[PDB]
Design an enzyme around this catalytic site. Structure first.
Site, short mmCIF file in Angstrom:
data_model
loop_
_atom_site.label_atom_id
_atom_site.label_comp_id
_atom_site.label_asym_id
_atom_site.label_seq_id
_atom_site.Cartn_x
_atom_site.Cartn_y
_atom_site.Cartn_z
N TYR A 44 -4.12 -10.01 -12.27
CA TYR A 44 -4.17 -8.80 -11.46
C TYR A 44 -2.86 -8.04 -11.60
CZ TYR A 44 -5.25 -5.84 -7.48
OH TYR A 44 -5.51 -4.76 -6.67
N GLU A 80 -0.38 -2.12 -9.89
CA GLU A 80 -0.31 -3.20 -8.91
C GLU A 80 1.00 -3.96 -9.04
OE1 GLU A 80 -2.42 -3.23 -6.62
OE2 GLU A 80 -3.97 -1.93 -7.50
N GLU A 126 0.82 -1.20 0.00
CA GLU A 126 0.00 0.00 0.00
C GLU A 126 0.86 1.26 0.00
OE1 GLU A 126 -2.84 -2.83 0.08
OE2 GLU A 126 -2.72 -0.81 -0.75
ZN ZN Z 1 -2.74 -2.52 -4.66
#
Ligand code: ZN
Length: 192
Positions: free
Chosen positions: A150, A157, A115
């Site tokens: 993803y 990401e 994060e």
């Molecule tokens: Zn993330």
């Protein structure tokens, strides 16, 4: 030493939660953040980024009520919403205590490093993960850490996860170098 200076930086930007919680685990999260290069931590401090540790759901905080009931990208078809997601990074950083490890409601090798990487990407580096150079590296190496639907689809990401591998420990750093040598070199050059 560099570790103590990073803890000094973190003491000015980490917001511990109201209420009671696992204080040792919160400390462990700070100690993992302290492994991030001090240049990035002090740049986050310069931009008034708060690293908020939470004892409840992300959407229990007033500043995240706009995410209530919303499905994050890549969570489609799971029945989960942001209310169930343990961490967020970008313009802010919010982290649920106890959910650091992979599989605790998220896919990252470490929640707080992933994060915080998003915040470094967005706040400090003006979305470098979407820059032409990183897009080129992502096109070749973005699937090599797995999670191909993803990490392999969203360069922001892949950047955040690679950053986490780079800074978590020597095992993940060496795994990133073997799997994603161009990404590793990019992160080496970014820290200089
Ligand atoms: Zn993330």
């Amino acid at each position: 030493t560099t570790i103590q200076q990073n803890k000094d930086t973190l003491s000015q930007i980490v917001v511990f939660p109201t209420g009671n919680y696992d204080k040792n685990e919160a400390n462990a999260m700070v100690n993992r953040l302290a492994n991030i290069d001090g240049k990035y931590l002090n740049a986050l401090k310069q931009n008034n980024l708060k690293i908020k540790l939470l004892s409840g759901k992300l959407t229990d905080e007033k500043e995240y009520a706009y995410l209530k009931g919303v499905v994050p990208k890549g969570f489609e078809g799971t029945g989960k919403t942001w209310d169930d997601v343990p961490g967020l990074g970008g313009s802010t950083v919010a982290l649920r205590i106890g959910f650091s490890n992979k599989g605790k409601g998220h896919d990252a090798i470490n929640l707080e490093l992933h994060e915080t990487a998003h915040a470094i990407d967005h706040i400090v580096l003006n979305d470098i993960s979407k820059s032409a150079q990183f897009k080129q590296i992502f096109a070749k190496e973005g699937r090599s850490l797995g999670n191909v639907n993803y990490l392999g689809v969203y360069p922001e990401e892949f950047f955040a996860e690679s950053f986490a591998y780079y800074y978590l420990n020597q095992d993940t750093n060496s795994k990133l170098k073997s799997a994603c040598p161009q990404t590793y070199s990019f992160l080496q050059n970014l820290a200089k």
